[PDB]
């Protein structure tokens, strides 16, 4: 029933997902994760993207009890949004110089990999070919 | 840092409790008797610390002696103190020993046949 009325509750969750406190963040992430699974494939991806825009920056949290509230949200958004956009977000930092920045990006990538293992195959970019190997997957650029 | 001992395992509990030096002064391959205490570590101890004993004995049953190995493994489970999980662990250990000691299990056929039958 959330698909019938989900755009009117988006700002109410966005204002709570802001940098307000350390306990008002798990609640918004849980609301998003329990609404995405409920509006799975019903045609409400717009508001889901609106909420994900805010839910993504909260990934950088050192609270051991506050990461799971965002990790579950990401694991729900991967399975209710499709890796074509979640991996698109998570691709920019897959090799970031920070040792504590890849620790979260690789974890989110693993969480988005076991789910939709072959679904994300037609979602990666065209890794250009270096002179030391054959990186480009030229076996998918046919015209037939 | 294994857990506490128990009076029911006093058959071979002289390794971590007494000065049972099998390598200092003892018969040949007496350390296999301490392996029975290691079997206690498989029974009394942690899950990984218990499975490590079986994983080590799997690569050491061929260099332990079939006679003493059987004489120490069969009475360990023949006693009435073999609990359900203890019985399962003893069965797994005997199966691993048989898979390691294939031809060596022939002379001990009169033992297990008298133990596994009841």
């Amino acid at each position: 029933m959330g698909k019938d009325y989900i755009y009117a509750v988006t700002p109410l969750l966005e204002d709570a997902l802001m940098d307000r406190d350390l306990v008002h963040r798990q609640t918004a992430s849980a609301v998003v994760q329990h609404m995405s699974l409920g509006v799975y494939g019903f045609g409400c991806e717009d508001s889901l993207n609106h909420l994900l825009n805010y839910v993504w920056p909260n990934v950088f949290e050192t609270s051991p009890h506050v990461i799971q509230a965002v990790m579950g949200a990401l694991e729900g958004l991967r399975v209710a949004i499709g890796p074509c956009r979640m991996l698109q977000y998570c691709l920019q930092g897959l090799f970031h110089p920070a040792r504590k920045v890849r620790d979260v990006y690789w974890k989110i990538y693993n969480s988005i990999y076991i789910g939709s293992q072959d679904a994300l195959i037609a979602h990666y970019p065209r890794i250009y070919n270096d002179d030391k190997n054959t990186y480009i997957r030229y076996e998918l650029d046919y015209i037939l | 840092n294994l857990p506490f001992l128990k009076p029911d395992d006093i058959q071979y509990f002289d390794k971590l409790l007494v000065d049972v030096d099998e390598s200092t002064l003892s018969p040949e391959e007496q350390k296999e008797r301490k392996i029975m205490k290691l079997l206690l570590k498989i029974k009394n101890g942690t899950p990984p610390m218990r499975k490590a004993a079986l994983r080590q004995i799997t690569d050491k049953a061929r260099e332990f002696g079939a006679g003493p190995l059987f004489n120490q493994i069969l009475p360990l489970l023949m006693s009435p103190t073999l609990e359900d999980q203890e019985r399962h662990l003893l069965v797994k250990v005997i199966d691993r020993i048989l898979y390691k000691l294939d031809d060596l299990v022939r002379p001990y056929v009169h033992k297990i046949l008298v133990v596994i039958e009841p």
Partner: protein, 531 residues
């Protein structure tokens, strides 16, 4: 019981002690007469009208198709020695006893053999003649095959024998058809290509143009030129050493033919070269818009070569398609989604206006509306997207203005051709798409929100009532790549007629409608949008 009126209208209703549920349809504009026939052991209704139709139940489906034959005056069921089970139709001064062996099907096939893998069509409205291309990697050309056979014979004649010379001559003179021996493993890059121009009325190949053992073909079009006259000019693409895996092409060319013989020939006017393998062509306001590699160039009539009237090298990875809107060109990249660029004629500049977000491996596209364009993918999905309503075509990492996918979902096969057309005169035109597994398909838009909600509830109920026999969930096998949106899975929404009776009654009561009423509602869409 079915009654047809004077016109093409005819109404059929189930039988009962009193009148029951009834529906109507046109088969029309002619005297709708009815006759009884014996087919498949049961009875069937032959409707004599402007289009002779046959209706009967089969496989739990009320198959109602038109008869592939001319109209007649009367009909009867003839079952005798010459025709144990057939229909004798009395036409205007003639009696034809005919029998059909088709049990269940919607489309009857008329086949025509070919030479290589076809990859494009062309509509010649002046003559209604089709212009197709055939191509295949690791193949041999006609003249190339002849030269190879002659060389093999000359090499075999270098033996001592020379007693077996007649055997070599016979081996070089025989002709084993490709259908019997397949085709030789003609090298790793040895390409074969040809262009054909035929008429669909028969198997009359009006014209054929072969090519060398390395020349290729990947696109064709039949357009006019504002500079030249009204003479229809064909433009065909060709590759040269387009070795794939690893991708290493050598060049490309565009052959301009004058469409000689009024549709049965073609004069080789100019072979305009290019440093990239072309993959598209289309008249952009009276100009050949060819997308070579990652550069879209609008060319005009060239007496010796296609003149680069305009160019734009802002293609993402590879221009594997193009569209012809009235004022914009919705190019279709081969690594990303579509980009609806604008070709300012006053400025004479092709600027990439708006791209998309998802990396859709576009394979086929079609302007479903003035701005909402649909397309297929390379994995099997299908996505129809449109730009926002307020988007001025002068303003502009991604383009200045961006659009989003409207309705996307997994299909099951690559939709090589998603054309917005009417499959049956009488209903609104739907998007008919092909597939890489032979199974054709249709996508019909809704008209009332009530029917939309009803179909959505039916699909949501059947997704838990009838589980897929493969073992995977329905949404996993329908949204395998992208989440479904505004697209009810008709493959499962109509698969309730072959379910358990108790489950059918439960699904009907949960939907607040009778099981027969639910079946009638589910078939109304297929009857108003299909044959």
């Amino acid at each position: 019981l079915n009654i047809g009126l004077q016109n093409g209208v005819l109404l059929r209703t189930v039988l009962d002690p009193v009148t029951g549920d009834l529906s109507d349809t046109r088969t029309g504009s002619r005297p709708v007469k009815l006759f009884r026939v014996r087919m498949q052991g049961q009875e069937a209704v032959l409707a004599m009208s402007s289009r002779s139709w046959l209706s009967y139940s089969y496989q739990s489906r009320f198959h109602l198709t038109p008869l592939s034959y001319e109209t007649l005056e009367f009909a009867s069921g003839f079952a005798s020695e010459q025709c144990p089970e057939g229909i004798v139709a009395i036409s205007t001064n003639t009696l034809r006893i005919l029998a059909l062996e088709k049990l269940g099907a919607v489309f009857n096939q008329v086949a025509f053999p070919l030479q290589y893998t076809p990859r494009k069509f062309v509509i010649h409205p002046e003559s209604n003649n089709l212009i197709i291309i055939e191509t295949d990697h690791n193949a041999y050309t006609e003249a190339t095959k002849a030269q190879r056979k002659q060389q093999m014979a000359e090499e075999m004649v270098e033996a001592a024998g020379e007693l077996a010379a007649e055997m070599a001559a016979a081996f070089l003179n025989e002709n084993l058809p490709e259908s019997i021996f397949g085709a030789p493993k003609a090298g790793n890059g040895q390409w074969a290509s040809v262009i054909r121009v035929m008429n669909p009325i028969q198997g009359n190949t009006l014209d054929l143009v072969q090519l060398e053992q390395n020349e290729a073909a990947f696109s064709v079009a039949v357009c006019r030129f504002s500079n030249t006259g009204e003479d229809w000019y064909v433009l065909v693409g060709v590759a040269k050493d387009l070795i794939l895996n690893p991708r290493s092409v050598a060049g490309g060319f565009v052959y301009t033919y004058k469409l000689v013989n009024n549709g049965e020939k073609l004069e080789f006017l100019h072979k305009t070269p290019v440093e990239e393998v072309p993959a598209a062509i289309a008249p952009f306001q009276g100009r050949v818009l060819i997308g070579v590699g990652k550069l879209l160039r609008v060319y005009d009539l060239g007496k010796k070569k296609l003149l680069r009237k305009c160019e734009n090298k802002h293609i993402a990875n590879y221009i594997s398609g193009i569209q012809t809107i009235g004022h914009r060109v919705i190019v279709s990249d081969v690594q990303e989604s579509f980009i609806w660029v604008r070709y300012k004629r006053n400025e004479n500049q092709l600027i990439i206006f708006a791209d998309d977000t998802y990396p859709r491996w576009v394979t086929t596209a079609s302007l479903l509306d003035y701005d909402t364009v649909a397309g297929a993918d390379k994995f099997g999905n299908i996505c129809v997207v449109r730009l926002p309503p307020n988007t001025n075509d002068e303003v502009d990492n991604g383009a200045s203005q961006k659009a989003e996918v409207i309705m996307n979902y997994h299909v099951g096969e690559t939709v090589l051709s998603l054309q917005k057309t009417t499959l049956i005169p009488g209903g609104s035109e739907s998007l008919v798409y092909t597939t890489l597994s032979g199974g054709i398909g249709i996508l019909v838009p809704f008209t009332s929100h009530e029917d939309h909600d009803f179909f959505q509830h039916v699909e949501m109920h059947l997704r838990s009532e009838h589980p897929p026999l493969c073992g995977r969930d329905h949404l996993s096998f329908r949204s395998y790549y992208f989440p479904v949106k505004n697209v009810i899975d008709g493959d499962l929404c109509e698969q309730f007629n072959s379910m358990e009776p108790n489950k059918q009654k439960n699904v009907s009561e949960e939907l607040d409608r009778t099981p027969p009423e639910v079946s009638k509602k589910l078939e109304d869409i297929r009857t108003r949008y299909a044959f």
